């Protein structure tokens, strides 16, 4: 096996379409758009090579090791129906390529450099098959859905949350005031906006203390466990950890982190801290739509959701389907299963390219948030079932009578939909009837029903299967 210097086609080493994947291999499905004149086999092979072991010219050091053992392998390519220059290229990566417990490392290989190759015009990572043997190297989520419900003592309905508004510009004491009034009306949770960290108008430790007062006041008043996701997102890991420690020392239940803008390295550290100190960890997906919006290029949210499940989070935003931010129904149902369930079979009608076995890693609570109000309640309960947190920020702080009545309206709407479902009512058909009936009964709900009766968010979907 002599060393021969010079450039040769990547497909001579990295296109292996009769390869039988191993049950420990990490698999990737890439939606690939080659440049004119670049055969799909060579494009797929280049993606496999430059995300695993290869570079642009032959290197002699390959002969010191076994490229058979380590190389990434494009093992199948299928043309995309409806597309004349799109292909799904499937690549298998030996488990030995990856650092145990590091989402950072997994992404660095699979999406590190290949999206910038001149030889392709566009590339989108659609799915990853994370084998049980790699899943087991991760701590994973701090608690997961069952444990969270058990710690909160909350069963039989979706959880209800709410982002405090204005996003920025409120003082710490006004933040706590708003929080107390929201929580006391029937919301389980409130939260810092994703961009509320520590700023001139409100420093974080002031907010944490006033929010603590509000949590404990609302909990004593209502007799239900309350929380507010205090944001630990910070410029440095040291500041992030200081914020987590303060939450621990106040005895409060839950913090949040912006996993993509803070980053996977910091997120994984924080998840481990939350596991070791009993804090629930809410994950906000800020920046995801920079990556995941377009069909031809980027990374689908389902992969970002798997990555979060691995790095660790008790909650993750899932979209709403019906609210102000995009999320097509079938796409969303598929990645909700990937977030919550133990075992999810391949189903291309929901964008699930690979069977995914989570090998008992805890499930992540999907959080539906953004532009939703009381009339969306039936659809949300129908889409998500009970194991979700439904969040109403504008839909609570925009109630005409204030936050407590706004909270009560959302809580009544959720409970009425839950009761109706349990009684045999079809929320897909009868949802409006269920809400209309509850509006007539509850004055707080009626005021919300009237203000937002004509408000819908119906636009052409960009992220289509």
């Amino acid at each position: 096996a002599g060393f021969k210097a010079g450039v040769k086609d990547y497909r001579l080493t990295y296109y292996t379409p009769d390869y039988v994947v191993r049950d420990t291999d990490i698999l990737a499905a890439f939606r690939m758009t080659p440049q004119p004149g670049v055969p799909p086999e060579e494009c797929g092979a280049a993606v496999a090579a430059e995300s695993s072991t290869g570079t642009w010219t032959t290197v002699w050091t390959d002969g010191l090791t076994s490229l058979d053992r380590y190389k990434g392998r494009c093992y199948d390519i299928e043309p995309v129906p409806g597309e004349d220059n799109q292909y799904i290229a499937y690549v298998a990566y030996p488990i030995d390529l990856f650092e145990e417990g590091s989402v950072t490392n997994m992404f660095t290989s699979i999406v590190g450099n290949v999206f910038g190759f001149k030889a392709l015009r566009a590339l989108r990572l659609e799915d990853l098959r994370i084998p049980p043997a790699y899943v087991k190297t991760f701590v994973g989520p701090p608690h997961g859905i069952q444990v969270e419900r058990d710690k909160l003592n909350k069963y039989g309905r979706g959880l209800l949350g709410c982002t405090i508004k204005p996003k920025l510009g409120l003082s710490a004491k006004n933040y706590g005031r708003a929080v107390y009034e929201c929580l006391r009306g029937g919301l389980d949770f409130t939260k810092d906006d994703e961009n509320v960290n520590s700023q001139p108008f409100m420093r974080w430790r002031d907010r944490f203390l006033f929010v603590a007062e509000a949590i404990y006041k609302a909990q004593a008043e209502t007799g239900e466990v309350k929380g507010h996701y205090l944001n630990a997102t910070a410029g440095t890991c040291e500041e992030m950890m200081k914020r987590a420690v303060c939450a621990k020392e106040l005895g409060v239940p839950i913090i949040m982190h912006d996993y993509l803008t803070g980053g996977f390295t910091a997120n994984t550290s924080l998840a481990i801290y939350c596991r070791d100190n009993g804090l629930l960890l809410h994950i906000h997906r800020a920046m995801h739509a920079v990556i995941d919006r377009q069909r031809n290029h980027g990374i689908h949210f389902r992969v970002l959701a798997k990555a979060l499940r691995m790095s660790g989070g008790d909650h993750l935003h899932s979209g709403t389907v019906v609210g102000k931010l995009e999320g097509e129904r079938e796409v969303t149902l598929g990645f909700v299963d990937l977030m919550r369930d133990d075992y999810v079979e391949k189903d291309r009608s929901r964008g699930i390219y690979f069977t995914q076995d989570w090998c008992s890693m805890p499930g992540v609570m999907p959080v539906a948030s953004g532009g939703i109000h009381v009339w969306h309640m039936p659809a949300l309960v129908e889409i998500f079932g009970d194991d979700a947190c439904l969040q109403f920020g504008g839909g609570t702080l925009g109630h005409p009578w204030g936050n407590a009545p706004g909270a009560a309206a959302n809580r009544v709407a959720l409970e009425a939909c839950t009761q109706a479902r349990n009684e045999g009512r079809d929320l897909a058909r009868e949802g409006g009837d269920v809400i209309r009936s509850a509006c007539k009964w509850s004055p707080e709900l009626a005021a919300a029903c009237e203000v937002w009766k004509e408000i819908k968010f119906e636009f052409d979907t960009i992220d289509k299967l």
């Binding site: 909350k154 039989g156 008043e221 209502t222 007799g223 005895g251 839950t418 349990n422």
Partner: protein
């Protein structure tokens, strides 16, 4: 604008914000338990043990996060493993409430595949 009273307005989780459940509505929830193959169970507490509280945290260092007293209530008999008869569940509600007429009593149900309580609501107030 109506003001949501802060006074004497404590709640008991699921279905506390709806009108009091009539017997038919309670029976319908029992039917939902049975239709889904879940395990009915009753739990009860005296008034002093019915509400979440914090008194054991006096013994703690800085580890009170998601620790509360009075989340656990007392089990009525055992979970009704294998029960697929709503009338048996309804009879046990009557029996529990007759034995402890001054107690808070809740009907819950367990799913053994998720291994979590999957429904629950108050059926008796003192």
């Amino acid at each position: 604008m109506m003001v949501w009273t802060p006074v004497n307005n404590k709640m008991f989780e699921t279905f506390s914000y709806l009108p009091p459940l009539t017997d038919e509505q309670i029976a319908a929830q029992v039917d939902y338990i049975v239709a889904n193959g879940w395990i009915p169970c009753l739990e009860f507490a005296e008034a002093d043990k019915a509400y979440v509280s914090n008194e054991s945290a006096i013994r703690f260092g800085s580890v009170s996060c998601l620790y509360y007293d009075n989340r656990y209530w007392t089990m009525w008999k055992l979970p009704m493993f294998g029960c697929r008869d709503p009338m048996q569940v309804l009879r046990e509600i009557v029996a529990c409430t007759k034995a402890f007429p001054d107690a808070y009593v809740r009907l819950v149900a367990f799913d053994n595949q998720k291994q979590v309580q999957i429904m629950g609501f108050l059926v008796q107030r003192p």
